[PDB]
Amino acid sequence: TRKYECCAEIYPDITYAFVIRRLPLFYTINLIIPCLLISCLTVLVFYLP
Amino acid sequence: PSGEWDIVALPGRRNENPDDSTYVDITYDFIIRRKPLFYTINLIIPCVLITSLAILVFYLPSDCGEKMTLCISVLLALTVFLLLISKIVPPTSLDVPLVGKYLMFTMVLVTFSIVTSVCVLNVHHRSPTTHTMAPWVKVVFLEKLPALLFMQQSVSEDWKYVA
Amino acid sequence: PSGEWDIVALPGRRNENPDDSTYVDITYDFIIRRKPLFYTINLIIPCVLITSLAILVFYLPSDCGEKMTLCISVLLALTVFLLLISKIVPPTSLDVPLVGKYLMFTMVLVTFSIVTSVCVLNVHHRSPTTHTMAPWVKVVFLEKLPALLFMQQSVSEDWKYVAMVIDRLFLWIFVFVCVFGTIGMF
Amino acid sequence: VTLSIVITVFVLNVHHRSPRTHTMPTWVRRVFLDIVPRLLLMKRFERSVKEDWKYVAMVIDRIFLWMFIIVCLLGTVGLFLPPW
Amino acid sequence: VTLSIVITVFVLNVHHRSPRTHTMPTWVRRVFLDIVPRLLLMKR
């Protein structure tokens, strides 16, 4: 229940909360693995003569 | 005829639920076969075309100094193809398209190739005066050489042969 | 005047189906011609301009070590043009556009070019202490030399001469096959 | 620019050439060692031929650069003339 | 990685310099030629 600025009475409401998850396999196979793989070269260049 | 998509069969079946005793519906099933030629020419030819360079980079000699350019160009192009083929496939984590799987595998292969190439390039330009380390390497690699079916044979030349 | 498109003729014909006896309709046919002056300058000229460089990687000297950069960049730009022409062409699996076919053909040709280029660049640097292989090479190349109209002529430069001979041969056959690649659609 | 890249790969293949293989200097020496005084450039066993073969490449590069910059400037003047 | 590129252009400059231009070895020799045991790097 709430009370708004317009009026004196109280107004009811129903709040529906959806808690959902994202299936991770797609973005972990096409987005994070390429960058995590190419981030392993920033230290490699120092060993190059 | 619509062009791309071709219909195979159009079955229709009436679904009755014995539990509800009221739910009734008619389900039509469309089994559709994509014509391959378009996506074939657009993706498969370039993908199989550029994937040879990953295993080709090793035949390149180290003295010229072109291993890094080749390998980085291949890896960048391969990541580009991966992102492009991921943009067209629907983002569903239920399964992986086999092309993307093979491409990620060859990407792991080429990113192992880059590190082994930088390692061989480092052991190549090594000077004879700084890192002598002869006896541990001499016997082992001169025994291994005939087992590799490679032609048999001033220290810098020996280091280059080792590389 | 619509601009890009020109109208040739607009006939209209009535169709009646005798067997059904209830199907009657009018079909208007539009024969439309594309004015190609815009698409030409914007797509075809850069296409031929960049594909004229396939025959070029061979004439570069191998000891400079710059074959790889040029050839890989040409292949990259060619793939970009292929993807672009595929995006602009309608996605119809019934027929193949001629330009896309030519680009795929010359792309495979450039792959053959890059593999033979890495082969000649590898055989270029071989020092005489590693891969001596003198008798099998001398007897064949001293006789192969006049058959190529090549100018007549320690071992470290002999390997360079080997590389030059073989890549000049590849260039001779490469321009020849590219001429037919162009003639196929002349 | 594609004409530039083809002419510069040509001059690379001419420069990086070796004396023992493609000597053939008879007709080239007389002509590409006397255009230099006309171009206003001050002058200087196998190493001597190498130096000469480098010098001829530098000279042809300069004599092409002059014409190329002339053509580029005249083109950029010719295209944007009617507005002004 | 940008810190890496700046440090690596620095080390390239340190490498390519010639003896007649940038000798300055007085402070360098005692400190940088006695750190290879501390780093477990064999000498020439």
Side-chain angles (χ1 to χ4, degrees):
Chain A
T1 62
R2 292 187 67 189
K3 182 178 179 179
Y4 293 98
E5 185 182 3
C6 70
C7 311
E9 294 84 3
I10 62 172
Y11 289 73
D13 60 356
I14 296 171
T15 300
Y16 281 159
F18 295 166
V19 176
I20 62 173
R21 290 187 291 113
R22 181 181 293 115
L23 271 296
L25 191 149
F26 182 76
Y27 289 101
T28 194
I29 201 67
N30 287 320
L31 192 149
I32 60 91
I33 188 167
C35 67
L36 187 147
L37 183 147
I38 52 89
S39 66
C40 294
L41 295 175
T42 187
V43 69
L44 183 146
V45 68
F46 295 163
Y47 186 70
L48 180 62
Chain B
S2 66
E4 292 180 354
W5 298 95
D6 188 359
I7 56 91
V8 175
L10 281 74
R13 186 174 64 85
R14 184 179 65 87
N15 282 320
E16 172 67 28
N17 191 359
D19 294 332
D20 292 330
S21 68
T22 61
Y23 180 163
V24 300
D25 53 356
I26 293 92
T27 60
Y28 284 100
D29 298 332
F30 294 165
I31 51 173
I32 310 301
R33 185 179 298 116
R34 179 181 293 117
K35 291 181 183 293
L37 189 149
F38 180 75
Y39 291 102
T40 298
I41 297 298
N42 294 320
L43 272 296
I44 300 299
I45 298 298
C47 182
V48 71
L49 183 145
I50 56 90
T51 188
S52 66
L53 277 297
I55 55 90
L56 184 277
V57 67
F58 290 162
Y59 184 73
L60 184 66
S62 65
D63 194 1
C64 184
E66 295 295 327
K67 292 182 179 180
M68 296 303 293
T69 301
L70 192 156
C71 186
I72 296 302
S73 296
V74 172
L75 190 149
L76 186 148
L78 193 63
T79 59
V80 171
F81 283 108
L82 183 62
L83 292 175
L84 193 150
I85 198 66
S86 66
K87 187 177 290 294
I88 192 65
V89 67
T92 64
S93 295
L94 190 148
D95 194 359
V96 174
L98 188 63
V99 173
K101 185 177 180 180
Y102 180 74
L103 197 151
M104 187 275 287
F105 287 166
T106 190
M107 186 177 291
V108 174
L109 186 64
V110 68
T111 193
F112 188 77
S113 177
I114 185 64
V115 62
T116 187
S117 177
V118 68
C119 183
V120 63
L121 196 150
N122 192 358
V123 301
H124 179 74
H125 288 86
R126 183 175 292 171
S127 67
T129 62
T130 57
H131 298 286
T132 61
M133 294 296 290
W136 180 67
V137 177
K138 295 289 185 181
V139 59
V140 62
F141 283 168
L142 270 294
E143 182 181 1
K144 181 260 183 64
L145 194 281
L148 192 65
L149 293 176
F150 186 76
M151 295 299 291
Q152 293 180 357
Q153 294 179 356
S154 66
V155 180
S156 66
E157 295 178 353
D158 195 359
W159 286 103
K160 295 182 180 179
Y161 190 77
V162 170
Chain C
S2 66
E4 184 179 2
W5 296 98
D6 191 358
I7 56 173
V8 176
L10 285 75
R13 187 173 64 86
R14 184 176 65 88
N15 286 319
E16 166 58 344
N17 186 351
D19 305 355
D20 298 359
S21 77
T22 64
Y23 182 146
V24 296
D25 55 356
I26 299 75
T27 60
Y28 286 103
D29 298 332
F30 294 167
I31 297 170
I32 309 300
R33 185 179 296 115
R34 181 179 294 115
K35 291 183 182 292
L37 193 151
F38 181 77
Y39 252 70
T40 299
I41 297 299
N42 290 317
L43 192 148
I44 300 299
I45 304 300
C47 179
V48 65
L49 187 149
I50 60 92
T51 193
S52 66
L53 301 182
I55 56 90
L56 195 277
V57 66
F58 293 101
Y59 187 73
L60 185 67
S62 67
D63 198 1
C64 181
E66 296 296 328
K67 294 181 180 180
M68 301 309 292
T69 299
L70 190 149
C71 186
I72 296 299
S73 296
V74 171
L75 189 149
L76 187 149
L78 189 62
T79 59
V80 173
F81 284 168
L82 182 61
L83 293 175
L84 196 281
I85 191 64
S86 68
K87 186 178 289 294
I88 194 66
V89 73
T92 64
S93 178
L94 190 149
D95 193 0
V96 177
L98 188 64
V99 176
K101 184 176 180 180
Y102 182 74
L103 291 179
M104 185 275 288
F105 182 74
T106 188
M107 188 180 292
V108 174
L109 188 63
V110 173
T111 299
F112 183 76
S113 178
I114 190 62
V115 67
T116 185
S117 178
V118 70
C119 181
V120 65
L121 194 149
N122 191 359
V123 73
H124 180 77
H125 290 87
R126 291 182 182 178
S127 66
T129 62
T130 61
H131 298 286
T132 62
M133 294 298 290
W136 182 66
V137 172
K138 298 294 188 292
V139 66
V140 64
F141 286 167
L142 292 175
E143 292 179 352
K144 183 179 180 179
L145 199 281
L148 192 64
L149 294 177
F150 192 77
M151 189 67 203
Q152 293 178 356
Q153 294 180 357
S154 67
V155 180
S156 65
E157 293 181 355
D158 185 74
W159 289 102
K160 297 181 180 178
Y161 191 79
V162 168
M164 187 178 289
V165 172
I166 63 171
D167 72 359
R168 289 286 296 275
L169 180 63
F170 284 108
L171 189 149
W172 282 106
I173 57 90
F174 194 83
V175 62
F176 179 78
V177 67
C178 184
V179 171
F180 286 164
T182 60
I183 292 171
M185 61 188 70
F186 183 75
Chain D
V1 71
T2 189
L3 190 149
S4 69
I5 74 95
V6 65
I7 197 66
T8 192
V9 64
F10 177 77
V11 69
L12 286 175
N13 196 0
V14 174
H15 172 274
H16 201 192
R17 182 178 284 175
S18 68
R20 293 182 182 177
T21 61
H22 298 283
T23 175
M24 296 182 286
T26 61
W27 181 63
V28 178
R29 288 181 179 177
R30 184 177 178 180
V31 59
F32 284 101
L33 274 299
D34 293 332
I35 297 169
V36 179
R38 185 178 177 89
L39 186 60
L40 188 63
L41 181 62
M42 293 177 71
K43 293 180 181 179
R44 67 188 69 186
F45 180 75
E46 302 298 328
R47 293 175 181 174
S48 66
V49 178
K50 181 64 66 68
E51 293 293 328
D52 191 1
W53 198 257
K54 179 177 72 175
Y55 188 75
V56 62
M58 187 179 290
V59 173
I60 189 167
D61 196 358
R62 296 291 299 274
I63 197 65
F64 191 80
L65 189 153
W66 287 105
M67 183 271 287
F68 191 77
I69 188 64
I70 293 297
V71 173
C72 182
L73 192 149
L74 268 294
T76 59
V77 173
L79 289 175
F80 293 97
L81 186 149
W84 292 93
Chain E
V1 71
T2 190
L3 189 148
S4 71
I5 71 169
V6 65
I7 194 65
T8 193
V9 67
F10 178 76
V11 70
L12 284 172
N13 192 1
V14 174
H15 178 271
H16 286 90
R17 287 181 291 177
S18 65
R20 293 183 181 177
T21 59
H22 295 282
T23 305
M24 293 183 286
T26 62
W27 181 66
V28 177
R29 287 179 180 174
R30 65 181 294 275
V31 61
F32 285 104
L33 274 297
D34 292 332
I35 197 166
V36 291
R38 187 178 179 90
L39 188 59
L40 188 63
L41 182 61
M42 292 179 71
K43 294 180 181 179
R44 67 187 68 187

